[PDB]
Structure 1
Amino acid sequence: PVLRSVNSREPSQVIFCNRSPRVVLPVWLNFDGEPQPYPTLPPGTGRRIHSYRGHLWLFRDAGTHDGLLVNQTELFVPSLNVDGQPIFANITLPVYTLKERCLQVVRSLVKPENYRRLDIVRSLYEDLEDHPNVQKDLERLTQERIAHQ
């Protein structure tokens, strides 16, 4: 896979900082490119992290798997610390589309087996059922990456 950590074994001091109101799940893509969950960060909290150069991270709502940003973009890979200075990862909400944001709220209020008992267009039921998925996001991101080459 294009989307995976490099096994550089070169350490990199990192700060995860959650400037989202969500509980954040950091996700590490391993050497095979499979996502590994790491302990969650409460909203407003940060901590120092021992990672390595070339290692690939992304961030999600720990409850809903909603997608989040890190340094204004989707993936995080740290360079070598320059003379041992930590690398900052500023985790935030993205500006969701009003559609996606409304999907979030309705999901939070309705059991999935009741989606189809809402008085709405048939097309939105599918949209509601289409939960945010780390695996689906990776296929979307992988194709985007292949288009830069």
Structure 2
Amino acid sequence: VLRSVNSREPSQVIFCNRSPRVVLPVWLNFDGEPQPYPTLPPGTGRRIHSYRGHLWLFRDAGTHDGLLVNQTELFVPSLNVDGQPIFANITLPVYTLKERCLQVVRSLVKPENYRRLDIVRSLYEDLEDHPNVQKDLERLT
């Protein structure tokens, strides 16, 4: 269901990483499979060639945490007006305090050791349930 349309209509796009994360752009191909593309360092930009009706999302390349693009989950290149590329503005979401704490704890403790942490069993399960594109594709469907 969530897949790019095979329009064959070029649409130039600027990916702009206004986050402090290393960004992984992910293209959803014509069968819905996530295809990763070269990463963007914090604060950097790239002019790229894409197509109308194509679907993109953006993640932290290291942890796969979710990121927003023009304030939403998904970005679809539209018709270029007067030769101008489309701006894909990639930013941090406002994470819940809990998801933000999970990010930091994950960054400090190797998954082998999540069970050694003195916390309720439901939080060990929250730590293990990493962010992941497949899970979000099912959710967004």
TM-score interval (norm. to shorter): over 0.9
1:15 is displaced (CA, Å) by: 0.3
**2:87 is matched with which residue?**
88
Residue by residue, what CA displacement relative to the aligned partner does 1:60-101 show, whole Å, maximum 9, x if unpaired? Answer: 000000010000000000111013211000000000000000
Question: The residue matched to 1:14 in structure 2 has which SS?
Answer: strand
Residue by residue, what CA displacement relative to the aligned partner does 1:32-80 show, whole Å, maximum 9, x if unpaired? Answer: 0100000000000001010000000000000000010000000000111
Fraction of identical pairs, as percent: 100
Which aligned runs of 4 or more in structure 1 are off by greater than 4 angstroms?
none
1:12 is displaced (CA, Å) by: 0.3
Structure 1 portions without partners, runs of 5+: 143-149
Residue by residue, what CA displacement relative to the aligned partner does 1:5-31 show, whole Å, maximum 9, x if unpaired? Answer: 000000001000000000000000000
Distance in 1 between the 2:140 and 2:35 partners?
A: 17
Normalised by the length of structure 1, the TM-score is 0.93
Distance in 2 between the 1:42 and 1:27 partners?
A: 15
Distance in 2 between the 1:19 and 1:88 partners?
A: 12
**1:116 is matched with which residue?**
115
**1:130 is matched with which residue?**
129
Structure 2 portions without partners, runs of 5+: none
Aligned ranges 1:1-149 → 2 under 5 Å = 2-142=1-141
Distance in 1 between the 2:100 and 2:107 partners?
A: 11
Question: The residue matched to 1:13 in structure 2 has which SS?
Answer: strand
1:120 is displaced (CA, Å) by: 0.4
Question: The residue matched to 2:136 in structure 1 has which SS?
Answer: helix
Question: The residue matched to 1:67 in structure 2 has which SS?
Answer: coil
Distance in 1 between the 2:129 and 2:86 partners?
A: 35
1:128 is displaced (CA, Å) by: 0.2
Tell me whether 75-84 or 33-42 shows the greater mean CA deviation: 75-84
Distance in 2 between the 1:83 and 1:35 partners?
A: 31
Distance in 2 between the 1:47 and 1:61 partners?
A: 16
Question: The residue matched to 2:89 in structure 1 has which SS?
Answer: strand
Tell me the C-alpha RMSD between the 2 structures: 0.5
